[PDB]
């Protein structure tokens, strides 16, 4: 996948984490991307490995 | 009535809520604690 710059690989899944209206993505301790927001529909999706 | 502060390069410790909001902070150059 590529989300407006974020390049990665994995399974995408519907989220339930309330991304504050201003948070582009989700950051995990040890600093790996684990959630994104879809630019077009603006919904949060988890990125499992 | 209005105020004017200025900004300097500091190092802080921000506490994040479970919704993802900053609820508390620590300025790491205040005292020994």
């Amino acid at each position: 996948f590529n989300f407006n710059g974020l390049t990665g690989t994995g399974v995408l899944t519907e989220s339930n984490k309330k991304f504050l209206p201003f948070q582009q993505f989700g950051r995990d301790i040890a600093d790996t991307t684990d959630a994104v927001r879809d630019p077009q529909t603006l919904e949060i999706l988890d990125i499992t490995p | 009535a209005y105020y004017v502060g200025y900004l300097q390069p500091r190092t802080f410790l921000l506490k994040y809520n479970e919704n993802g909001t900053i609820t508390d902070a620590v300025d790491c150059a205040l005292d020994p604690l």
Binding site: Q23, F25, G26, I29, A35 | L13, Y16, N17
Partner: peptide
Amino acid sequence: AYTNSFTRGVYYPDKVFRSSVLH
């Protein structure tokens, strides 16, 4: 006059989310 802020002027350094992570 001059006054004392107490804990004021904290902004979100950027986008990105975060849960319970002392960043």
